[PDB]
Structure 1
Amino acid sequence: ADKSDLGYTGLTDEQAQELHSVYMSGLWLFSAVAIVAHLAVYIWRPWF
């Protein structure tokens, strides 16, 4: 016995993602690009 609005059950996974997916999405975004800001910045110095 539970909600999952015996239909909301599915769309949930999507809404439930509206807060989750998105979360783990921007999460690994500013956590990778940043890493670039650390390298990409000290990476455009050397060229040879």
Structure 2
Amino acid sequence: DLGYTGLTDEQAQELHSVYMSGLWLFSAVAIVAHLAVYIWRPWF
């Protein structure tokens, strides 16, 4: 479509899927650390 970066739709889809997989993994790791710290010493 716009093609400001020379990326086809399917290439963008594949890269975005990989990026969001890593994002969810990182978010889950942070959530687990947050719950562990909250149990150890809550901030609320």
TM-score scaled to structure 1, two decimals? 0.44
Structure having greater relative contact order (Cα 8 Å, sep ≥ 6): 1
Provide the identity percentage: 100
Aligned length: 44
Q: Which has the larger radius of gyration?
A: 1
Unaligned runs of 5+ in 2: none
Unaligned runs of 5+ in 1: none
Structure with greater proportional helix content: 1
TM-score scaled to structure 2, two decimals? 0.46
- Structure 1: 4+ residue segments shifted above 3 A: 5-18, 41-48
